DNA sequence: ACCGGAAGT
DNA sequence: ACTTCCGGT
DNA sequence: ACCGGAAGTG
DNA sequence: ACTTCCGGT
C-alpha cells in the first residue's frame, strides 16, 4: 500500500471523519487530527517513529509526482490533482 | 496492466494522436479510432478476438465504478471523474 | 454506437 | 477485473 | 505549519 | 516511493 491508498481508505470509512475526512469540494481532504493520521500509517508501513512532519514530506513528495497541491491558507488541507499528468504518474510511479 | 492504466499509457503519447488523444475538456478523451485501440488492448491480455463492442463494455464496467462517465452525443468519447468515490476504486479494484 | 443484464474466467 | 454474448434503443 | 534539498531505506 | 533529519520562510 502507497501513501495515498492508505489516506483514501480512512477517508472513505465515516467511522474515521473525526480526524481525517473530505471537505466536500472536489478532491480535497483535510486532515482533522493529524497525529492521529501520522500514527495509523505509522502501523501500516511498521514505522513506530512515524509522526505528521514526516508523513508530509511524503505529501510534498507528491508534488512533484503531480498528484497532490497544498490547499494555501487552509491548515491541514490537501487536495487530489484533476489532470491528466496527475493521472499518468498516479497509474505509473517510476 | 488495468484497463484504465492502458488508455492513460496510449494518451501520453502523442504518436497515437491518430486513433487516441485527449480533448483539452479537463479529463475528457475520444477514442478516434475504436478498433485500433481494442487491437492493441487486445494483445496486451493475449485475447486477440478483442474489439471495441467489448472494451466499450469494460467501460460501461467503469460507470457503476464510478471512474468513468460518456460524454453523450459525442461519438467515441469519455471522460473520467474526479471524485472521492472514483478515486476509491482506482486505489481498490475488485 | 451506446446501453446494461447475465453467465463465465 | 474484466471478458463474452446480445437484444434492445 | 509548511517548505524542500540530501542522505538512507529492504 | 518513501523515511529520516532539519534549517529554511
Same mark, same amino acid.
Given at each position: 500500500?502507497?501513501?495515498?491508498? !492508505?489516506?483514501? +481508505?480512512?477517508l @472513505?470509512? %465515516?467511522?474515521?471523519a473525526?480526524? =481525517? $475526512?473530505?471537505?466536500? /469540494?472536489?478532491?480535497?481532504?483535510?486532515? =482533522?487530527?493529524?497525529?492521529?493520521?501520522? /500514527? *495509523?500509517?505509522g =502501523?501500516?508501513?511498521?514505522? %513506530? +517513529?512515524?509522526?505528521?512532519?514526516? *508523513?508530509? /514530506?511524503?505529501?510534498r #513528495? #507528491?508534488?512533484?509526482?503531480? =498528484?497532490?497541491?497544498?490547499? $494555501?491558507?487552509? /491548515? #491541514?488541507?490537501?487536495? !487530489?490533482?484533476?489532470?491528466? @499528468? $496527475?493521472? !499518468?504518474?498516479? $497509474?505509473?510511479?517510476?
Amino acid at each position: 500500500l502507497q501513501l495515498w491508498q !492508505f489516506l483514501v +481508505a480512512l477517508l @472513505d470509512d %465515516p467511522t474515521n471523519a473525526h480526524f =481525517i $475526512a473530505w471537505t466536500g /469540494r472536489g478532491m480535497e481532504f483535510k486532515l =482533522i487530527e493529524p497525529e492521529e493520521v501520522a /500514527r *495509523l500509517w505509522g =502501523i501500516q508501513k511498521n514505522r %513506530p +517513529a512515524m509522526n505528521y512532519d514526516k *508523513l508530509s /514530506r511524503s505529501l510534498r #513528495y #507528491y508534488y512533484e509526482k503531480g =498528484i497532490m497541491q497544498k490547499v $494555501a491558507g487552509e /491548515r #491541514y488541507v490537501y487536495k !487530489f490533482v484533476c489532470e491528466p @499528468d $496527475a493521472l !499518468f504518474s498516479m $497509474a505509473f510511479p517510476d
